[PDB]
Design a binder for this molecule. Structure first.
Ligand SMILES: [Cl-]
Lengths: 393, 305
């Protein structure tokens, strides 16, 4: 689940978090009008895509850069025309780039102080953690390696809430002074509360700064949502478009299939996330290149064995399939039947190596073995992997 | 205090079990399996069904009542995500010694609040959520794992996954070895029991002569365990530890099925965990198919077979 800059900045502003004033626009004229109506000394036009790196990006129109500053509303309309409906590639997008359908027109504010401030649940601490640094504008991992003493932490007690004194102490360590310290401390309490409210696993503000004119502003920010809180975060999840998600992945999710594409050519189909990762792994250890991680989950319906397959075959790059299922509960001959039924109805034409373990394995490899579809049976996981690799050599 | 309850992890023939979310699809199905396996399921709970009966056993509205009326020393939870943390919290307040939460999907924020409470008390031991449970081969099964593939033996097994663990267990049996006890601590980032919790029990369990630790990417539990073994499983009597860490081929920044299996901001990588464990004397099987053979060789090498 990801939100576009305009969506998250709105969500933040709606919760008392100070952010730049902005308009969103679908066309260049709307962008020109946005800029006029903004009525600001200076304006920033920013292509709206999920991938980071926009500022150092390029558009398929010829325009260099996804983020631009100007005072002339006119230039904003012109620049917008070179962005809308074009593709923007950055260091974080794929080759062909990503379609831009919207741009943000916002008041560009000057920045006197740049600081880092995030809230996340640290797995090490058990409980919310406030992480800040006076050295903002920079990749946090970096500041940690460079100047680890410039990193400040406040362990928040989830049951009490963040204390005024924690917000103040952090506000002061970030470098804020006088009334700005009180503002920063407040923005911080508000960011923490927003963090709890939308079920974020993390809210990262960078730069968390101040204008020469006296305002503490969250200039840019990134929010990660906890997928398990979706049933209580409907509205926020509805704003997820998925337009930037790998196609096979949206398709797989449609069937409660957890698919993660890799670039290899041997595809996997497994039940159990640990076993899935391990299968992608054992394939690699035997000189193969896994094409994907796919965890069928547990409630494996025939229809899902079907879609699971439909999604691996449809992939041009797939040259073989390693199915690794540990039966336990259900007995393998059943599983084997659904595998055959789907592969038949799909006319699977790529070789399939099937590793079935659990109950009735013998018969199940018979039911499999009685088919005449490019299905091959493996005795153990190492055998399965070696066979899938032999298959594409 | 919380660490005191570690002992509750060692379920046995005398452990009596109750099921929260007892009348549901999952709880009913798995209580049937527990009964046929031999587990001591004596009762269960469901909201608004106190008084009724289910699977030939009494059903209560509250855990407090069932704990009281049945003498249960353990609870297993199949309560759906929106109410599963509530369920854990209730069994804690009723001071059930052992609470196994199977339920996948509990919001992380909910688990962080449950933990605050959990770590400040010592009656209740929590395993999970998003875990398959615990099993003492032949004596007691709490959770969704296939009991029949398990055989009582000498390998304590602790793991962050489900099916991957069954693979492991099967492998030990294909070389005639056994499990003394198996704990699936699950795949969530905030849970009630980690690797260190189980290793402690394994190190002090004379029935456990070897240990298999199965981990994956994400978090720092594997590194913490590495740290605990360097510290506590060194010496003329250390026990052999074999491990497999899944996710070597996993791409960064993606949740790989389990909510907690993610490599973020340079942390959680599989190789750093392998390297850490190796430094603690853990014999890492680079391949998930060789955990059985690897631990067999370790015993073989100590003439422990
Ligand atoms: Cl209940």
């Amino acid at each position: 689940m990801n939100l576009q800059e305009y969506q998250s900045k709105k969500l933040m502003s709606d919760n008392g978090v100070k952010v730049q004033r902005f308009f969103v626009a679908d066309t260049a004229n709307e962008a020109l009008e946005a800029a006029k109506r903004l009525n600001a000394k200076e304006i920033v036009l920013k292509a709206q895509i999920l991938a980071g790196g926009r500022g150092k990006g390029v558009f398929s129109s010829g325009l260099k850069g996804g983020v631009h500053l100007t005072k002339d509303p006119e230039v904003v309309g012109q620049l917008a025309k070179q962005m809308i409906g074009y593709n923007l590639a950055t260091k974080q997008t794929p080759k062909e780039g990503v379609k831009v359908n919207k741009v943000m027109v916002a008041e560009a504010l000057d920045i006197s102080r740049e600081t880092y401030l995030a809230i996340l649940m640290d797995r090490s601490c058990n409980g919310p953690v406030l992480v800040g640094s006076p050295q903002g504008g920079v990749d946090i991992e970096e500041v940690a390696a460079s100047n680890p003493e410039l990193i400040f932490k406040e362990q928040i007690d989830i049951i009490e809430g963040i204390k005024d004194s924690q917000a103040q102490r952090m506000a002061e360590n970030l470098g804020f002074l006088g009334p700005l310290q009180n503002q920063a401390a407040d923005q911080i309490k508000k960011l923490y509360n927003l963090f709890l409210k939308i079920d974020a696993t993390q809210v990262e503000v960078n730069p968390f700064g101040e204008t020469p004119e006296g305002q503490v502003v969250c200039f840019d920010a990134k929010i990660n949502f906890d997928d398990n809180a979706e049933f209580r975060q409907k509205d926020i999840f509805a704003m997820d478009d998925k337009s930037e998600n790998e196609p096979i992945e949206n398709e797989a999710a449609k069937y409660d299939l957890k698919y993660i594409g890799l670039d290899g050519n041997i595809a996997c189909f497994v039940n159990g996330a640990g076993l899935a990762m391990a299968t992608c792994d054992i394939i690699f250890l035997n000189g193969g290149k896994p094409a994907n991680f796919l965890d069928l989950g547990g409630g494996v319906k025939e229809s899902q064995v079907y879609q699971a397959f439909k999604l691996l075959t449809a992939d041009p790059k797939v040259e073989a399939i390693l199915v690794n299922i540990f039966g336990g509960i259900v007995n393998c001959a059943i599983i084997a039947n659904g595998i055959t039924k789907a592969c038949r109805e799909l006319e699977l034409k790529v070789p399939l190596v099937v590793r079935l373990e659990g109950t009735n394995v013998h018969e199940a490899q018979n039911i499999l073995t009685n088919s005449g579809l490019p299905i091959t049976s493996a005795v153990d996981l190492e055998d399965a992997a070696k066979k899938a690799v032999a298959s594409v050599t | 205090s919380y660490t005191a309850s570690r002992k509750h992890l060692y379920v046995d023939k005398n452990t009596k079990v109750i099921c929260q979310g007892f009348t549901g699809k999952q709880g009913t199905f798995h209580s049937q399996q527990a009964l046929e396996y031999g587990t001591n399921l004596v009762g269960g709970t469901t909201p608004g069904k106190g008084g009724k009966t289910h699977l030939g056993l009494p059903v209560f509205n509250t855990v407090k009542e069932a704990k009281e009326q049945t003498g249960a020393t353990a609870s297993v939870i199949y309560v759906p995500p929106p109410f599963a943390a509530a369920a854990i919290n209730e069994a804690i307040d009723a001071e059930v010694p052992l609470v196994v939460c199977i339920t996948e999907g509990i919001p992380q924020q909910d688990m962080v609040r449950v933990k605050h409470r959990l770590l400040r008390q010592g009656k209740t031991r929590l395993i999970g959520p998003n875990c398959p449970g615990v099993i003492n081969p032949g004596e007691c099964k709490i959770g969704i794992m296939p009991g029949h593939i398990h055989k009582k033996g000498r390998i304590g097994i602790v793991s962050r996954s489900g099916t991957l663990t069954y693979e492991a267990v099967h492998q030990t049996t294909q070389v005639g070895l056994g499990q003394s006890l198996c704990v699936g601590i699950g795949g969530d980032p905030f849970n009630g029991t980690d690797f260190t919790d189980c290793l402690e029990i394994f190190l002090n369990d004379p029935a456990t002569e070897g240990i298999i630790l199965i981990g994956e990417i994400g978090g720092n539990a594997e590194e913490n365990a590495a740290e605990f073994l360097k510290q506590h499983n060194s010496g003329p009597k250390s026990k052999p530890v074999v491990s497999f860490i899944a996710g070597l081929t996993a791409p960064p920044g993606r949740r790989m099925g389990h909510a907690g299996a993610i490599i973020a901001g340079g942390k959680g990588g599989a190789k750093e965990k392998i390297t850490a464990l190796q430094s603690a004397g853990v014999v890492v099987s680079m391949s998930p198919a060789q955990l059985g053979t690897t631990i067999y060789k370790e015993f073989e090498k100590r003439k422990m077979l």
